Design a protein around this ligand. Structure first.
Ligand SMILES: *C(=O)C(CC)(CC)C(=O)Nc1cccc(C(=O)N2CCN(Cc3ccc(Br)cc3)CC2)c1
Ligand SMILES: *C(=O)C(CC)(CC)C(=O)Nc1cccc(C(=O)N2CCN(Cc3ccc(Br)cc3)CC2)c1
Lengths: 811, 808
């Protein structure tokens, strides 16, 4: 077997080969249609059942904006209907999201500096032409964030300005600040209080972006006015670590203080004319730490559908205990300066009115927070019926229908004592498994459920058919049995369901076929409303079909000494020669919450894995233990042991490939990844120098004590209880183990990285220097220009130090 | 001509090699800051005790020693003075001394300490216990100084304000109220008695206040002590950040607002403070000294009648020496009416006195030479100054200026005109002259003998490659007598008594020695001076066994100047074979690399390189110093445009004389201005230079400071083209498209050449699609060893070795 040697291109020639083949800037294309909403036309004479509204980019260099398409009552089943995108807004930055109120037809969105509104599909009817956006007028000096329509009165919006909540009336022009917690004309180290804003760790590590929730119902007052309510989180970041990059912000490093959090409630009195009478800020009747002992993080919150109770999903610091809590507005009382007056209000609140833990669970691995939580209309004063998803019972996420009894508590506030841990716990009347099996329901990154309350069905997405494809399923929540798959095999799907439960949209792709979006009509046979069938209705987005210049990889699997099937992707060298062994590049992520190996189109983001194969590299990707869509036990393998197990699985997979394929030259293996991938690239060269000639680490984690609480503690615990795993997991603390031979270690980092600070790369550099070890470095100090330089530099480095003829001579 | 290829060592082999040969760390302080105190004991064996600072061997604290100078020596033998420690180990970078009381004052760590030796209370025979100056001040005290008028009183800086403290009464007292330590650097940018960044970094002025050397007595039998001090407002000055913040005037932006202030301290007969009166200039600094941007130097006349100052314009092409009577200052009074009364009480006759003014089309070079003779007429001041402005070489002038009443009378409510305060010049006499310079920077100064009417000075008169000590009469200047011996470069000081001198001297072959020399006169002519060796203070180890020195060479440039260089020949030079060449460069103003000194400490690794098979070259291009103003002035407005021509010229000269130089395998390497020229070399002359390794390069002249950049390049508005052509970062498209030719090295927290220079360059290299290599040293012995290791390996893999030739 002769070594294959990649063509040795000049710098200028690699630059040209890359620019000639370059297809997409920043590893993304036009954002496919998304955030769909179905509105019925309710027009017996007309040809259309529904209008769909959605966000999309019509082209590559376009803004994300609002479109609608018409859903015909009938189609020609001989042909394929392509829906035409009619713009909703009359435009001469982008819209990331929007709000809608069914009853009025009011849209509300942010677009750059402005909050705007328009009306369509309400009582005022359906436009045939683009609408002019109506700017909501403000006096606020700074940009307004996170606007939301009051579901009980669409003349009212809320929004954030300089970390306080304001409200504003789009009819009357009345604008009112509700919270006085932050001073814009002040320092960041002096003022670390914020209302209605999710803090860094909740945004980055729990994907909660909003910190305030309109109560969905008005309370009518005896005057003929009403009360609106906003539940909001209030945060004090004073004790939280501050870090600067070239300004600065509050980053809870692992084992340090998270913010100090609480629930507040703004109570807003409006008269018969829609003008504010008064605004009463309310606080909890006893402080947060008393009512919810042991709770670090407010993971999710909202209201029950009639607005009787607020709810929250609450996590302990170790993220191994989860509680769902009902929080009556009655637990809130005016913020009172007068201790005398204040004392009266506290006793004016009955002892019966205390928090209600309707659900609690624990695990020895970790809680994976998700967006599934559906509350049924209350049928009885002292019962709540809901659907929630959990891995805690079987180690795969499944749907459970639960009924919790709303008991009066043992604990009495009057007695002047403190509550016991189980004093607010609610008895569980009923806990039925809706789903079960060796596969998971999806509840993250847009995956959710739709509940049909008429037919007593729940639509959900899951791994049931294959851990490599997401599919849409329907099942009864009343007498769970048959789970019906609604999407077709040989694609991975990403769906949403009409609110009306009679249509679904799928965005779908596979290894060979770029992404498409199609609409499917849902029906039931006349005899059984419980049974669901689907028919193709129309295409929303066609793909351009297979790219002529992209060769997909093949999915492979292998049974592993660890007891699991591990999946991988193999990119065979183009124009493959017989009796020639070729240099190999392992591309890796390997960290929690991500899966690289599945049946999806890889030709956009991972196009350059194809470019590499095209130059003569074997490219390999493997999802090691710790990767997702394989259940909690598979995910849990590296708890406390991050960095210790991932390279075994990668090497196992590589030896699998090399015994099965003799074109793989194990003498010439490179590894490359970003972030956790950068981490595992370094660990690889450190631990398995015999396997890996070269490691290129992008934005690596090098010291877990420099990373945040929400992520690090979940997988590695508090550092005080895992000094040894933090040590063995931190590449920076083990610089001595890297090779004493140059051209083997390349570090790549942005200077202004907000997630994986440059601090990781500079502390590693500091320890590499102490240990007298060599390293190559590239810095991208700000754009498409940076990305081209990286790709150019990476190809040139692999050529010169792995693949080329000269590479072999250099040793 | 068959190419030599260096032995291709592994990383581990190179690390071992460096560590085996490593003789020094971070490139021990030789005795320095000497002082001579007379014994005045007719029966004792010694004339003088000398005090100095030194480290007693490496990895040791700089501290105070003394040695005994014997009245006589055995002229057959060589006397090695003993180092006697002056200080006991505790419960030093500089020191102050008060002759009359024998008081030493110095900072050591967070403490200010004092001891007594050599005054009335006599001479210790054992280490003395340092006495702490006790304080209530929370933060570190800086820049402590004895009041020459009263050695019980010290001043110091605390949180950018001036304080005084009595080492006997223990009274402590804050004099100035300009800074609040609690407030942030964006809000509070005022300081008193403290030299700001550009004056410390670009003009070597470290102190910003000066004790008046005389007390005025009061009616009561008390006294008034005075401190002249500069007050700075940095509010308008650019701020920069490093992993705190600091005030850095970027070229073309604002320098601090500056003024003089006077603190008037009333002391009663028992030595207690009665009162402190803060005083300000009768009219603003901008009115009294028009066009003055920088306070370069300040002090007092020897009797304390005037404060003096050397003032520069922003272009640094006008220098003025100004006398400032304490009567120009009035109490700070916010009471509008009372203030007016105070203004009226100051006579019109009291006025700034410009005793000297000079201009140049090149630049003013600030130096430390300024001697004021005692006044013998209220109408006149006699002094010795040094200047390049008359001939283009720095010479000593003896000047007498007439202190006349000014035409400007303050009461007439006008503003003064530019020449209103100019004093006439009664006399200007050249003391030295010729195609050579007097040294006045980095410790070089003069000692004036006012009995024999001689001045001692150092100079290049004998050669541009050696500094020598000289003496000449300042009355009938003629014969200049060299006192140091040829074949060494000397760095000297003279006893205040003008009867001894010390020299620290070395040459290419011989490491640094320090020796004491007795000065005397033939009985018939006291103006005639001879020297005799007296003793060794510091013996050298003799020639290093490891180290092979370079050879100094010169070539007659097409530019019309002789240019000097150093050549390290490859070790075990094989005939017929040609070796790869590393050019080491600085090439910037105020520095000379090529001279007759020992290069075996700092430039040792140039010898390691030669030991591996590299020809090493060093050349002093035009712009370098010790060759006069015209030579230095070559790159005025044109930094980066001439230096590499001189480098290549000397390289081509060496190559045509020596077949053993492989011109196809030349690398260049430098730090700072040398990193700058390393980048310029690769950019302008990729035909000559395979590899450029640039350490802490300047890449963008508008990111460097006012004091340096504007001196040599002017205001960026007056020099668009020089600033563009001189700024590497603006020309990233002119770099090679071939990788492994360009390596950048930078510290991340560099306070002098900011990392910003390297990051802006990388931004433009990336935008232009250009390759580069980078090493960062993120905060030391550790860093030094890694750099030497990476640099040897980089040159091996990309210039010198078999593999390097194959690679292209
Ligand atoms: C890590 O989590 C981080 C950085 C903190 C998150 C933003 C990260 O992922 N950073 C990142 C930087 C740059 C690019 C990418 C990235 O997504 N890709 C996609 C795949 N591409 C593979 C590739 C590309 C080119 C070649 Br020549 C070979 C292989 C890598 C960059 C992520
Ligand atoms: C520039 O003015 C600066 C950086 C702002 C001032 C501190 C600078 O000069 N920096 C600097 C950093 C590190 C070392 C040095 C230095 O003076 N030397 C000594 C000379 N030495 C020659 C050498 C050493 C080793 C080898 Br393998 C070859 C040549 C280089 C560094 C200055």
């Amino acid at each position: 077997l002769e070594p294959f040697y990649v063509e040795r291109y000049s710098w200028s020639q690699l630059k040209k080969l890359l620019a000639d083949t370059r297809k997409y800037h920043g590893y993304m294309m036009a954002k496919a249609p998304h955030d769909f909403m179905f509105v019925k036309r309710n027009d017996p004479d007309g040809p259309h059942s529904d209008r769909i509204y959605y966000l999309a980019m019509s082209g590559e260099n376009r803004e994300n904006t609002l479109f609608y398409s018409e859903i015909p009552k009938t189609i020609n089943r001989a042909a394929v209907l392509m829906l035409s995108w009619k713009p909703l807004l009359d435009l001469f930055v982008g819209i990331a999201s929007y709000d809608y109120h069914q009853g009025s037809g009011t849209f509300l969105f942010q677009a750059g500096s402005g909050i705007y509104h328009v009306k369509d599909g309400g009582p005022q009817g359906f436009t045939q032409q683009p609408l002019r956006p109506n700017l909501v007028e403000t006096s606020c000096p700074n940009i307004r964030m996170d606007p939301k329509l009051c579901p009980a009165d669409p003349d009212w919006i809320a929004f954030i300005h300089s970390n306080d909540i304001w409200i504003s009336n789009i009819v009357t022009r009345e604008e009112r600040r509700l919270t006085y917690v932050h001073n814009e004309l002040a320092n960041m180290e002096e003022d670390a209080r914020s209302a209605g804003v999710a803090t860094f760790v909740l945004q980055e590590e729990f994907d909660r972006y909003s910190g305030y929730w309109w109560c969905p119902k008005a309370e009518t007052t005896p005057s003929g006015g009403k009360i609106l309510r906003i539940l909001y989180e209030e945060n004090d970041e004073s004790e939280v670590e501050i870090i600067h990059v070239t300004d600065s912000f509050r980053y809870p490093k692992t084992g340090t203080a998270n913010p100090k959090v609480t629930f507040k409630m703004s109570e807003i009195m409006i008269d018969a004319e829609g003008r504010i009478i008064d605004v009463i800020d309310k606080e909890l009747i006893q402080p947060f730490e008393i009512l919810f002992e042991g709770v670090e993080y407010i993971a999710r919150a909202g209201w029950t559908p009639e607005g009787k109770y607020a709810w929250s999903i609450l996590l302990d610091r170790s993220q191994t205990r989860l509680q769902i809590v009902l929080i009556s507005p009655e637990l809130f009382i005016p913020v009172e300066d007068d201790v005398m007056e204040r004392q009266r209000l506290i006793e004016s609140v009955p002892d019966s009115v205390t928090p209600l833990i309707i659900y609690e669970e624990t695990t020895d691995i970790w809680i994976n927070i998700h967006d599934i939580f559906h509350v049924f209309p209350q049928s009885h004063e002292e019962e709540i019926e809901f659907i929630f998803a959990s891995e805690c019972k079987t180690g795969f996420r499944h749907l459970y229908k639960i009924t919790s009894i709303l008991k009066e508590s043992k604990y009495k506030r009057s007695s002047g004592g403190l509550p016991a841990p189980s004093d607010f716990k609610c008895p569980i009347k009923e806990e039925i498994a809706i789903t079960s099996g060796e596969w998971e329901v999806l509840g993250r990154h847009g995956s959710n459920i739709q509940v049909d309350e008429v037919r007593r069905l729940v639509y959900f997405e899951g791994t049931k058919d294959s851990p490599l494809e997401h599919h849409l399923y329907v099942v009864s929540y009343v007498n769970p049995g048959e789970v019906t798959r609604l999407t077709d095999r040989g694609y991975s799907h990403s769906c949403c369901i009409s609110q009306h439960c009679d249509f679904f949209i799928s965005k779908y792709s596979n290894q060979k076929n770029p992404h498409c979006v199609s609409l499917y009509k849902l029906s039931s046979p006349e005899d059984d409303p419980t049974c669901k069938t689907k028919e193709f209705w129309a295409t929303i987005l066609d793909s351009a079909g297979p790219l002529p210049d992209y060769t997909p990889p093949e999915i492979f699997s292998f049974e592993s000494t660890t007891g699991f099937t591990l999946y991988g992707m193999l990119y065979k060298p183009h124009d493959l020669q017989p009796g020639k062994k070729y240099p190999t590049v392992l591309f890796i992520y390997g960290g929690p919450q991500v899966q690289l190996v599945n049946n999806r189109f890889k030709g956009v983001k991972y196009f350059r894995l194809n470019t590499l194969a095209s130059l003569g590299y074997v490219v390999v990707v493997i999802d090691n233990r710790g990767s997702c869509h394989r259940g909690l036990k598979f995910e849990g393998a590296f708890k406390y042991k991050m960095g210790q197990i991932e390279i075994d699985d990668q090497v196992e997979g590589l030896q699998y490939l090399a015994s099965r394929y003799d074109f793989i030259d194990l003498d010439r293996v490179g590894i490359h990844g970003w972030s956790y991938g950068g981490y595992l690239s370094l660990m690889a060269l450190m631990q398995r120098s015999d396997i890996f000639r070269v490691a290129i680490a992008g934005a690596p984690v090098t010291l877990w004590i420099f990373y945040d609480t929400g992520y690090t503690e979940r997988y590695m615990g508090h550092p005080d209880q895992n000094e040894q795993g933090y040590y063995l997991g931190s590449v920076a603390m083990q610089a001595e183990k890297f090779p004493s031979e140059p051209n083997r270690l390349l570090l790549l980092h942005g200077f202004l990285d907000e997630n994986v600070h440059f601090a990781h790369t500079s502390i590693l550099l500091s320890f590499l220097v102490r240990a007298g070890k060599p390293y190559d470095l590239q810095i991208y100090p700000q754009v498409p220009e940076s990305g081209e330089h990286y790709e150019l530099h990476l190809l040139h480095y692999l050529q010169e130090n792995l693949g080329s003829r000269i590479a072999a001579l250099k040793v």
